[PDB]
Design a protein around this motif. Structure first.
Motif, PDB file in Angstrom:
ATOM      1  N   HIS A  11      33.177  58.695  52.851  1.00 29.70           N
ATOM      2  CA  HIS A  11      32.729  59.416  54.038  1.00 29.70           C
ATOM      3  C   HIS A  11      32.172  58.445  55.074  1.00 29.70           C
ATOM      4  O   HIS A  11      32.502  58.528  56.258  1.00 29.70           O
ATOM      5  CB  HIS A  11      31.647  60.428  53.654  1.00 29.70           C
ATOM      6  CG  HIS A  11      31.210  61.182  54.879  1.00 29.70           C
ATOM      7  ND1 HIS A  11      32.030  62.103  55.512  1.00 29.70           N
ATOM      8  CD2 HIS A  11      30.040  61.167  55.598  1.00 29.70           C
ATOM      9  CE1 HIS A  11      31.351  62.598  56.563  1.00 29.70           C
ATOM     10  NE2 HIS A  11      30.132  62.063  56.660  1.00 29.70           N
ATOM     11  N   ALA A  12      31.328  57.525  54.620  1.00 32.01           N
ATOM     12  CA  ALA A  12      30.730  56.539  55.513  1.00 32.01           C
ATOM     13  C   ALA A  12      31.808  55.686  56.173  1.00 32.01           C
ATOM     14  O   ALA A  12      31.606  55.147  57.259  1.00 32.01           O
ATOM     15  CB  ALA A  12      29.778  55.634  54.727  1.00 32.01           C
ATOM     16  N   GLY A  13      32.958  55.584  55.520  1.00 29.27           N
ATOM     17  CA  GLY A  13      34.067  54.810  56.068  1.00 29.27           C
ATOM     18  C   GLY A  13      34.747  55.584  57.194  1.00 29.27           C
ATOM     19  O   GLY A  13      35.056  55.034  58.250  1.00 29.27           O
ATOM     20  N   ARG A  14      34.980  56.865  56.941  1.00 28.46           N
ATOM     21  CA  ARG A  14      35.636  57.730  57.915  1.00 28.46           C
ATOM     22  C   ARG A  14      34.836  57.785  59.216  1.00 28.46           C
ATOM     23  O   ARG A  14      35.406  57.742  60.306  1.00 28.46           O
ATOM     24  CB  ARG A  14      35.792  59.146  57.350  1.00 28.46           C
ATOM     25  CG  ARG A  14      36.572  60.007  58.347  1.00 28.46           C
ATOM     26  CD  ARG A  14      36.821  61.391  57.745  1.00 28.46           C
ATOM     27  NE  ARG A  14      37.716  61.287  56.599  1.00 28.46           N
ATOM     28  CZ  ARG A  14      37.943  62.330  55.806  1.00 28.46           C
ATOM     29  NH1 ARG A  14      37.360  63.472  56.048  1.00 28.46           N
ATOM     30  NH2 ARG A  14      38.747  62.211  54.786  1.00 28.46           N
ATOM     31  N   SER A  15      33.514  57.869  59.094  1.00 29.71           N
ATOM     32  CA  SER A  15      32.653  57.915  60.272  1.00 29.71           C
ATOM     33  C   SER A  15      32.795  56.631  61.087  1.00 29.71           C
ATOM     34  O   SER A  15      32.886  56.666  62.314  1.00 29.71           O
ATOM     35  CB  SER A  15      31.196  58.091  59.845  1.00 29.71           C
ATOM     36  OG  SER A  15      31.055  59.325  59.152  1.00 29.71           O
ATOM     37  N   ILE A  16      32.813  55.502  60.388  1.00 26.12           N
ATOM     38  CA  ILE A  16      32.945  54.205  61.045  1.00 26.12           C
ATOM     39  C   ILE A  16      34.294  54.103  61.753  1.00 26.12           C
ATOM     40  O   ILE A  16      34.377  53.644  62.891  1.00 26.12           O
ATOM     41  CB  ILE A  16      32.807  53.074  60.020  1.00 26.12           C
ATOM     42  CG1 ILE A  16      31.369  53.037  59.497  1.00 26.12           C
ATOM     43  CG2 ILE A  16      33.135  51.731  60.682  1.00 26.12           C
ATOM     44  CD1 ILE A  16      31.300  52.136  58.262  1.00 26.12           C
ATOM     45  N   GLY A  17      35.344  54.542  61.068  1.00 23.13           N
ATOM     46  CA  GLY A  17      36.687  54.507  61.637  1.00 23.13           C
ATOM     47  C   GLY A  17      36.784  55.419  62.856  1.00 23.13           C
ATOM     48  O   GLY A  17      37.503  55.125  63.810  1.00 23.13           O
ATOM     49  N   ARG A  18      36.058  56.532  62.810  1.00 21.77           N
ATOM     50  CA  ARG A  18      36.074  57.485  63.913  1.00 21.77           C
ATOM     51  C   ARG A  18      35.575  56.825  65.196  1.00 21.77           C
ATOM     52  O   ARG A  18      36.179  56.979  66.258  1.00 21.77           O
ATOM     53  CB  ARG A  18      35.188  58.689  63.577  1.00 21.77           C
ATOM     54  CG  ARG A  18      35.287  59.729  64.697  1.00 21.77           C
ATOM     55  CD  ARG A  18      34.439  60.949  64.338  1.00 21.77           C
ATOM     56  NE  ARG A  18      34.650  62.013  65.313  1.00 21.77           N
ATOM     57  CZ  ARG A  18      34.130  63.223  65.136  1.00 21.77           C
ATOM     58  NH1 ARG A  18      33.417  63.478  64.073  1.00 21.77           N
ATOM     59  NH2 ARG A  18      34.332  64.156  66.025  1.00 21.77           N
TER      60      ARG A  18
END
Length: 22
Positions: A11-18
């Motif tokens: 999840h923390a990755g998806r936010s960063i990618g966003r």
């Protein structure tokens, strides 16, 4: 409870990618 640790990583990755997408 254990899942949360793994789930947070993805999840923390998806936010960063966003933000990267902009």
């Amino acid at each position: 409870f254990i899942h949360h640790i793994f789930r947070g990583i993805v999840h923390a990755g998806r936010s960063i990618g966003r933000f990267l997408t902009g």
